[PDB]
Amino acid sequence: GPMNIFEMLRIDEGLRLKIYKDTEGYYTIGIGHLLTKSPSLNAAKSELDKAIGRNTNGVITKHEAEHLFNQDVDAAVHGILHNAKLKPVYDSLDAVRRAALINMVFQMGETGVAGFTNSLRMLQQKRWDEAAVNLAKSRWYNQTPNRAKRVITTFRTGTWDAYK
């Protein structure tokens, strides 16, 4: 198998077939698919049953998680292209550097990554080292350091060495 965004996020997020609380405490399933920010487990069960189209009882198959994963990766890509701040940054970046941005939008969302501003401007201006240093000072690095370290390596080197 070769290297791509789908294989990148698979190593980062991992697979979980049952409803679990994430790093922020929100109910999630599959390959890091956020169900609800609501504190109720029942609220998450309704969102899951909606996304799958059957009574899941908080349990899904690997294939069912693959569908959500492919849908989330695609949603992240379209989200970047529809965001006025994210799209000019995206188009400038190369194939491998685009994947690193998708990873962040998969993890934090459209609005969350668009709030970086300075780091986004640095990547658009091709300043790879300056952006890498600035990303470590962010709240994203303090919360998930293992995750961010691999993404920062991808944005600075322009290669997928952090996964090889």
Add this chain to the structure above:
Amino acid sequence: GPMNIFEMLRIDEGLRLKIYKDTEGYYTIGIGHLLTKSPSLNAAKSELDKAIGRNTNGVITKHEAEHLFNQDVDAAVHGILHNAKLKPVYDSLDAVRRAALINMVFQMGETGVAGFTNSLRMLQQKRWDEAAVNLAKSRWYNQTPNRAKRVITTFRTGTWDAYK
């Protein structure tokens, strides 16, 4: 290896970005995606708007068409796996020939393909020439000869020769 089921159906079905009527007469779009059995263009446009999530106005993009195509191919595979007559034939076939069975299901549906009792039994028993002769005797061959010929050649030879 650029040849597979997706490429096989791209050749057989073709790509159309405007609402068209199939061989049967029903409103279709993309790479053979059935919209409705209704003879209304207003009803089909509504079914296309609900499938995409925007005011399409009868026209879709190549990307939107690839989404519907991936959904239909997946649905065709599930149709085989959920069917008790289709699954043992599927599991006994090689990769190239599995694609020819998915092709038939994509085109006719799980129920219609299960009606080829004798031909399916011949495919399960590895009787390639006998299956080829019997499949040509069907209404499927009379209604759409050129597509059936290709699928038959694939089942007969176990190669991609009918396409490339």
